[PDB]
Amino acid sequence: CKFAXATYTSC
């Protein structure tokens, strides 16, 4: 679910 995180990321 995307790189990892949420911010800079998408998911």
Short mmCIF file of N, CA and C in Angstrom, two decimals:
data_model
loop_
_atom_site.label_atom_id
_atom_site.label_comp_id
_atom_site.label_asym_id
_atom_site.label_seq_id
_atom_site.Cartn_x
_atom_site.Cartn_y
_atom_site.Cartn_z
N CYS A 1 0.85 -1.18 0.00
CA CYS A 1 0.00 0.00 0.00
C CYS A 1 0.90 1.24 0.00
N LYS A 2 1.63 1.40 -1.09
CA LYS A 2 2.53 2.53 -1.23
C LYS A 2 3.77 2.30 -0.37
N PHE A 3 4.77 3.15 -0.58
CA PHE A 3 6.01 3.05 0.16
C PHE A 3 5.75 2.66 1.62
N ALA A 4 5.23 3.62 2.37
CA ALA A 4 4.92 3.40 3.77
C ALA A 4 4.71 4.74 4.46
N UNK A 5 3.52 4.89 5.04
CA UNK A 5 3.18 6.12 5.73
C UNK A 5 1.76 6.52 5.32
N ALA A 6 1.64 7.74 4.83
CA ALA A 6 0.35 8.25 4.39
C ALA A 6 0.49 9.65 3.78
N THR A 7 1.21 10.50 4.49
CA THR A 7 1.43 11.87 4.03
C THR A 7 2.06 11.86 2.64
N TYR A 8 3.35 12.15 2.61
CA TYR A 8 4.09 12.19 1.36
C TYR A 8 3.60 11.09 0.41
N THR A 9 3.17 9.99 1.00
CA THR A 9 2.68 8.86 0.23
C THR A 9 1.28 9.15 -0.31
N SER A 10 0.64 8.10 -0.81
CA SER A 10 -0.70 8.23 -1.35
C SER A 10 -1.70 7.48 -0.47
N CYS A 11 -1.54 6.17 -0.44
CA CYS A 11 -2.42 5.32 0.35
C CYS A 11 -2.21 5.66 1.83
#
